[PDB]
Design a protein around this nucleic acid. Sequence first.
DNA 1: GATAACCTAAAATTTTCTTAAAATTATATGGGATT
DNA 2: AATCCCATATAATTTTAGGGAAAATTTTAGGTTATC
Lengths: 314, 314
Amino acid sequence: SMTVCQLYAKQIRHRGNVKHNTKLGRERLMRILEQDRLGSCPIDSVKLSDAKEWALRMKEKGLSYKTINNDKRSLKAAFYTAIQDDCIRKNPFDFQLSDVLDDDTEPKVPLTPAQEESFLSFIQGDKVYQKHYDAIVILLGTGLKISELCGLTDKDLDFENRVIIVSHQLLRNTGVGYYIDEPKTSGVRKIPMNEEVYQAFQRVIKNRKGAKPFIIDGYANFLFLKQNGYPMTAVDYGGMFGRLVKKYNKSHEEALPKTTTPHAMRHTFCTRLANAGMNPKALQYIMGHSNITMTLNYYAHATFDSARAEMERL
Amino acid sequence: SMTVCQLYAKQIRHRGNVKHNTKLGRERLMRILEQDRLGSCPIDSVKLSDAKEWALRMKEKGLSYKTINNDKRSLKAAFYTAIQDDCIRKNPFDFQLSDVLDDDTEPKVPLTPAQEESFLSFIQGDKVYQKHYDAIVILLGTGLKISELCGLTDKDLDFENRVIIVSHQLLRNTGVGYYIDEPKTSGVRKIPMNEEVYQAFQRVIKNRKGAKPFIIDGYANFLFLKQNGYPMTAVDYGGMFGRLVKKYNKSHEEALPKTTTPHAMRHTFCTRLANAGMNPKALQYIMGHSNITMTLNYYAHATFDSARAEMERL
DNA sequence: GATAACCTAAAATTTTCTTAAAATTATATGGGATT
DNA sequence: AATCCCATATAATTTTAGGGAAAATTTTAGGTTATC
């Protein structure tokens, strides 16, 4: 429609076969517009300067670079649907955000081999968090995503062949409760269990107690449960991680990286295998990446000296 | 710009900063449009059926699958300019070519180690083609593209460090004759020389004779010269390889792959290093690829068995 | 007198070059358990 | 009595998901010359 908020509203109904988290996402952006000057402006009067200044206010509001850069993409697509409908001729969001803003994103550093051992040793000895020692060993040893872990049921483990069958994730959102989703990439993948993780899974099965009646979209007997008898979710693990890391840094001189969350374990897992010289496409299959490019980002850039040594070695 | 030919002529004049080879290529496609019924049609009367039926005629004419897919990309770009100028609404070339034609491209198989050994041995014993042994040894050992090799001069070799400095390519075309271009991507890169490549350049420098007065775009003293005293070109190495391979297959039971050309040397170089497990980003620097995806195609797909094996080795 | 090498013009083929959804994480807040 | 743990709603950040052809390389036809 005419105003920007109305154009985005039409763009949302146009492409409405989205998942619940996407619905929440679009809702968030829809509110930013309804509060920003850009929201009530006729799209036929939105120039390149108006869009760039919008990114500035977003920054002045407090939003991060990637948040604004993704919202810029949501709006850029909305203005391409209005051009495909002959409402304007030039997309005011077709510009590089790095020209208007500096990318001050926080670097996500994985754990060094030494940090990983200290961190693991602490969890194992901590009276409050040692119960989560298994899940963390499993995260560091498989690269699983947090909701991929939370979806693991009995029928997803092959202890005879020592394989993990990753075919889904368990999610939870306000109102809608729990649901099962597809990884979105089919996208199934099998992960082998090294000795350390093998024992970890076996210990979790043996120590499971108090699971309440719970079957969702055909899945039951989940491995990782909250104290309340229902399965764990990303929020539960993320919140626990935060308390654990703050507890660790209090008794250790060298704190853990500011970004030590459940995904840091995935990042650590991949970085280690890449630095150890693992086959790129094999690491890709294990990580479950759709594009080999995302996997290759974990590989340090090469230099002539770097390349020359590789050829002298081969 | 009513007819497709007029539209394409405008797209070429619009985007005019191109290199000579590009001019020839555009001219080739232009002749096709002039000889095909599609060329004389008004652009606002070209449906999605007209486009596919054009692909069928191109294939029936004999043009390869890749040739047609590239020409479709050129026409699709022209029709996206006509749409940006309020002339059409739907791009008739926005469709997958695999739905209309079968991709029957000849696979480009590299040389097995034994094939390479046999090929090299043959070249070194042939009275006619042994003078090209050094150049072919350099290709297999460096991965240079053919015109990158032709473009090499004395000021491009660092015998002290045993490095090759690739910064340009030497080309020739009917009319303009020789000229110096760029890798067209910082295409500059340094390739280390192994023992066999070092001795190879050493022989080419010592055995050089009869170079005629020649300097182009500031480059003189080229290493690989034709029997006429002027530098070699891709066409020169192309035709020579054609005879050389047709001669080899006459005296060996197992013929060389159909696509055994100067690029096949570059293909072999890359596959070998990739198969031996070279750092993928280091191999990219050597090959001169811009997108790591290009380098990654030389790596065989991974399966669960493949991935579990790597994870066991680590 | 045949072929094969070689050269070049013309033509062909091949190599090469995020238009956000959907997840994960941080935070404010409350009741209950711990030091 | 101050403090941490756990839980959940709300809000924010992060991870993840191709060719809008140019420019090269290769093939071939046709001719001369060297070779067998």
